Design an enzyme around this catalytic site. Structure first.
Site, short mmCIF file in Angstrom:
data_model
loop_
_atom_site.label_atom_id
_atom_site.label_comp_id
_atom_site.label_asym_id
_atom_site.label_seq_id
_atom_site.Cartn_x
_atom_site.Cartn_y
_atom_site.Cartn_z
N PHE A 239 44.32 60.25 27.92
CA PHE A 239 45.06 60.09 27.32
C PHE A 239 44.24 58.93 26.28
CE2 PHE A 239 48.63 56.88 25.68
CZ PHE A 239 48.99 58.20 25.57
N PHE B 16 54.12 60.26 35.40
CA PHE B 16 54.24 61.20 34.18
C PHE B 16 54.37 62.19 34.57
CE2 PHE B 16 52.66 57.54 33.06
CZ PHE B 16 52.16 56.62 33.29
N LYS C 154 52.74 58.37 56.05
CA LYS C 154 51.52 57.32 56.13
C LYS C 154 51.74 55.76 56.08
CE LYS C 154 48.39 58.34 52.59
NZ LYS C 154 48.85 56.69 52.88
N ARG D 135 47.05 48.50 50.98
CA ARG D 135 47.58 47.80 50.72
C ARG D 135 49.42 47.46 51.88
NH1 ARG D 135 46.07 50.81 46.18
NH2 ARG D 135 47.24 52.37 47.47
N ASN D 136 49.82 48.45 52.21
CA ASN D 136 51.04 48.51 53.83
C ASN D 136 51.18 47.81 53.94
OD1 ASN D 136 52.04 51.01 51.41
ND2 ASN D 136 50.33 51.31 51.83
#
Lengths: 353, 353
Positions: A41, A97, A213, A278-279
């Protein structure tokens, strides 16, 4: 005759597999076309086109810095021109997207074209469940598989050893060898010495693990942050794996149990996610401090999001419309702790059989 | 009528399992006898008897300090007296003491007696494979199951939440309800709110995991120490789990695949071992420094050993006599690195499918 490959995405993961694919196309000239097209893009860094920055000195300066790209990996700003009589499309764009890319590709692809979706997870909510690979098929009319495993774009790009699962159901409209894609073509397309590839059929199995997960990783973080250690974490991973298998067989039946414990997309991806990410990090801080998920999300990941926070709510909504909430106590427990104010210390009692 | 329970152990795990059993005997007076006997090999402390220190103020001052024992957990210095018509024997002593305990119990137990072995792993070498529960059965003539999971005596004693698998094949000699032991009796005997118990039949499956996980943990350490991260570690765990399943079904074909990925003894025990422990730590230093195993074993573990170092040799010897070395590339790779001087960086190429 040889297979022309196009990657639609150009991001972190997009640029990285496009390199993986470009290195194999050069490695197998009797199977794949020399040049790999990558849809970028169009954006301008310091008034210079990103597509031309990649087309020498061969570096995605914004999304994958310091990584030298082959020579045959060509960046393309036009979506339709990158697809110009393509054989294999590798879908590697963020989930939000996918409706844009599909609507823009409608009536521009090809019935013969076969695709692979690198989009982790699946669509889940109150209205139903859907594989992103199936959305591509019913909006483009093309056969579509999936690529998922215990891997990070950054490590694969730096050629650090990891694995991936590639799943694809051979279709009816198959005509074999040097004419259509089979598991041998997919093995040759993605396999690298630093990136081990296992090719299977179970597209559904590989996909549900990628999302579920992250709900399990939250349960591990809670348990770690409470100071219960590795044994308590390993127990949530075991319970979590069981719930991922149960979810897959209940809603995609269809799916082989084998996929969940034998493949990178299953057990390995669960292990790595629950070990660090992150989780697990957000969930660990929730237990340490007592702040709610999003407060912790803001403090640790600034820009980015712990996707498990969204997933536990969506899974719950789907299960409420199914009347199958009781069947998944761990998924329910994570949701109750995150959204409502469930004690967290009650986790063993909630999952107790 | 009710079941009298005796624990042959008194160490770390022995005292802990005896505390778990004594809590449940008090909790189920219609199923189990009130008092639980624990065989303690007599030793003197303050010139004091250890058996009497436990029989008020209820603390195994040497092997499990700071842990208050119920009231009905009675220490016994006489093996035979502790077995005084007893219904259930829980074996919980180190592997090297099993031939002593068995030779001393010969002609003193009783055919109706059913047993559970808490001894992790199994016997493996050039001459053959043997379950330690089977050794108990062939030396005592009593039915014998196993107890194994992702757990540490210290955490279970502190009532830190973890899980375990209990495996037992219901025998032909079985009567039924309040007369003999079944899976319901075993669930009631070991299950605690802080210690989740899953009761199955597959004694072989839960046993092989307890030994083989340490060979896999070495492969994880090598990969971590090389700086390959969590994704590379998760890949070895996936390959390792597959090799544990393959080993079990090849040498104990009555073993269920399910046991390995559904139970604490399987996947969860593998996860915890590969996350942290003696085997992973030694292997990590081998990669960090370049010293041999034992040089690394002395540097970190002091007066302790990384079992997996012996197991990878023992498995290799068994596989050489079977002609099945090619079937287990990860088990072979770990061996070759540890004993011979195999590059370690070649690990992906060695396991490559």
């Amino acid at each position: 005759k040889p297979f022309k490959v196009t990657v639609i995405g150009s991001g972190n993961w997009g640029t990285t597999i496009a390199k993986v694919v470009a290195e194999n196309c050069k490695g197998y000239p009797e199977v794949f076309a020399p040049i790999v097209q990558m849809w970028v893009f169009e954006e301008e860094i310091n008034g210079e086109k990103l597509t031309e920055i990649i087309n020498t000195r061969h570096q995605n300066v914004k999304y994958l810095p310091g990584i030298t790209l082959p020579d045959n990996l060509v960046a393309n700003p036009d979506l339709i021109d990158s697809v110009k009589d393509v054989d294999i499309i590798v879908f590697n764009i963020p989930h939000q997207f996918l409706p844009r890319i599909c609507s823009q590709l409608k009536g521009h692809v090809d019935s013969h074209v076969r695709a692979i979706s690198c989009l982790k997870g699946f669509e889940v909510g109150a209205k139903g469940v859907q594989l992103l690979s199936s959305y591509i098929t019913e909006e483009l009319g093309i056969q579509c598989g999936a690529l998922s495993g215990a891997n990070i774009a950054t490590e694969v790009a730096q050629e650090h050893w990891s694995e991936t699962t590639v799943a694809y159901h051979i279709p009816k409209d198959f005509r074999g060898e040097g004419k259509d894609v089979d598991h041998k073509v997919l093995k040759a397309l993605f396999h690298r010495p630093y990136f081990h590839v296992s090719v299977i059929e179970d597209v559904a199995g590989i996909s549900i693990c990628g999302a579920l997960k992250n709900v399990v990783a939250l349960g591990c973080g809670f348990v770690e942050g409470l100071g219960w250690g590795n044994n308590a974490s390993a127990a949530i991973q075991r319970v979590g794996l069981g719930e991922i298998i149960r979810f897959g067989q209940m809603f995609f039946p269809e799916s082989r149990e084998e996929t969940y414990y034998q493949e990178s997309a299953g057990v390995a991806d669960l292990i790595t996610t629950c070990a660090g990410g992150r989780n697990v990090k957000v969930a660990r801080l929730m237990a340490t401090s007592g702040k709610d998920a999003w407060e912790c999300e803001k403090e640790l990941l600034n820009g980015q999001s712990a996707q498990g926070l969204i997933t536990c709510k969506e899974v719950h909504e789907w299960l409420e419309t199914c009347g199958s909430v009781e069947d998944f106590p761990l998924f329910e427990a994570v949701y109750q702790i995150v959204y409502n104010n469930y004690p967290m210390k009650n986790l063993p009692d909630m999952i107790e059989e």
